[PDB]
Amino acid sequence: ALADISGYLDVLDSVRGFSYLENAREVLRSGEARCLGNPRSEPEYVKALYVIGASRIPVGDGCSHTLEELGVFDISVPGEMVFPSPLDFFERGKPTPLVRSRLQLPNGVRVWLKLEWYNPFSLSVADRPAVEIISRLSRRVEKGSLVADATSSNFGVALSAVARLYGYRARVYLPGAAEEFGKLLPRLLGAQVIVDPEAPSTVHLLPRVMKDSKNEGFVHVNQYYNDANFEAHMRGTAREIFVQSRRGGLALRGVAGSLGTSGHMSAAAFYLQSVDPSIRAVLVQPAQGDSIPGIARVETGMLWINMLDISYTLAEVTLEEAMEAVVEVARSDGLVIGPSGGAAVKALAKKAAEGDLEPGDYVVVVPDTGFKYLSLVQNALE
Ligand SMILES: Cc1ncc(COP(=O)(O)O)c(/C=N/[C@@H](CS)C(=O)O)c1O
């Protein structure tokens, strides 16, 4: 028997840890789930179902239900694209587009681009964790409380818009080296913004944010460590790649992406590799000395990409190389991607060149629009 998952979403405030993901893998890999006689005695199972994008839960004595029955494959989007509010637009106006590129890689490696700038608040993938985190927050923390974090830019914008849509106040802390959209836009959206000229990276701002949190009593929402960030991309970004691939007729052989907190590619890889363990995750390691905005090297500390049981390969990519690739996707497809998108295109293009990859369809996740990166555009032309 099928019941609504919404009623049972207190498990989000009660399950901790990662042992619950064993349930996900089996349900995904099997393509079904066992009915629970007492949904409340199985909090691990129930959470797993939500995290894979189920909308309903299987309830009763001895039965099972498929992914389709559970609502993993439910179409959310109104065909007419009419939405009664922006937050409902983020939620229901999904998936983000999967576009097959005219870009041609060797060895029958077909490039598809998942355009995460089709998120309404930050025009970037960071919307998805921002809505998930703040939505759980709305359960506990009283309205008018100040919520805050460090960001390279996107999340700070996403946090500021979404905070204020939930009655919360926002503060964002940014490195001096972040772009002007990051420093400026949260202010337009009603946040405070703090820029540390001496912080060379977003991770290095973390102690300052924790220190001030202890002093002032704001809720440091902590995108690096907040399990909602991984979970949002499990039921959103990754699930979409699962569903789109299948509805698309794709022979999905891998994913390619970039790492900041590591939330989105950990989710894609884990979810996809639950379904089919051979699926490669090709991940970018920005080259040493170089800065690619929004992303970083793994060894600077990332929660999920280490701890979860995820097969991935790395490819080294310089800024200059991420910028070359922006330029060529612009000339191939007329679509203007961000630095970190080009980095992932490049990264896959190398594994493809090397002979390391099967022929078939790969999905790259493109985190944002290149329209926010005029300097790096300018410098890559001259
Ligand atoms: C342009 C762009 N590309 C990739 C990512 C990497 O995504 P995750 O690995 O975080 O899912 C991000 C996330 N950026 C975080 C900074 S670590 C933020 O906006 O504060 C980004 O903004």
Number of domains: 3
Distinct compounds present: the ligand Cc1ncc(COP(=O)(O)O)c(/C=N/[C@@H](CS)C(=O)O)c1O
Architecture of the largest domain, according to CATH? 3-Layer(aba) Sandwich
Biggest β-sheet strands, sense, barrel: 6 strands, mixed
Secondary-structure element string: EHEHEEHHEEHEHEHEHEHEHEHEHHEH
| Helix amount | 40-55%
- The gyration radius over C-alpha positions equals 20 Å
- β-strand percent reads 15-25%
Explain what you see:
The chain is of the alpha/beta class and 382 residues long. It has three domains: 2-70, Conserved hypothetical protein from pyrococcus furiosus pfu- 392566-001, ParB domain; 86-123 and 227-381, Rossmann fold, CATH 3.40.50.1100; 127-220, 3-Layer(aba) Sandwich (Rossmann fold), CATH 3.40.50.1100. The chain is 41% helix and 18% strand. It contains 14 helices and 14 strands. It has helices at 21-30, 43-51, 67-70, 86-92, 127-140, 154-165, 180-188, 206-216, 227-248, 263-275, 303-307, 319-333, 339-354, 374-381; strands at residues 2-4, 32-34, 56-58, 64-66, 98-104, 109-115, 146-150, 169-175, 192-196, 219-220, 252-257, 280-286, 313-317, 360-366. It has a six-stranded mixed beta sheet, sandwiched between helices. Strands 9-8-7-10 form a four-stranded parallel beta sheet, with helices on both faces. β8, α7 (180-188) and β9 form a beta-alpha-beta unit. α6 (154-165) runs parallel beside α7 (180-188) and α9 (227-248) packs across α10 (263-275). It is globular. It binds ligand E1O. The ligand Cc1ncc(COP(=O)(O)O)c(/C=N/[C@@H](CS)C(=O)O)c1O is lined by residues 124-126, 151-155, 202, 258-264, 294-295, 338, 340, 367-368. InterPro entries: Cys_Synth/Cystath_Beta-Synth (IPR050214), P-phosphate_BS (IPR001216), TrpB-like_PALP (IPR001926), TrpB-like_PALP_sf (IPR036052). Pyridoxal 5'-phosphate binds at residues 154, 260-264, 340. Its EC number is 4.2.1.22, 2.5.1.47, 2.5.1.65. Homodimer. It holds the Pfam family PALP.
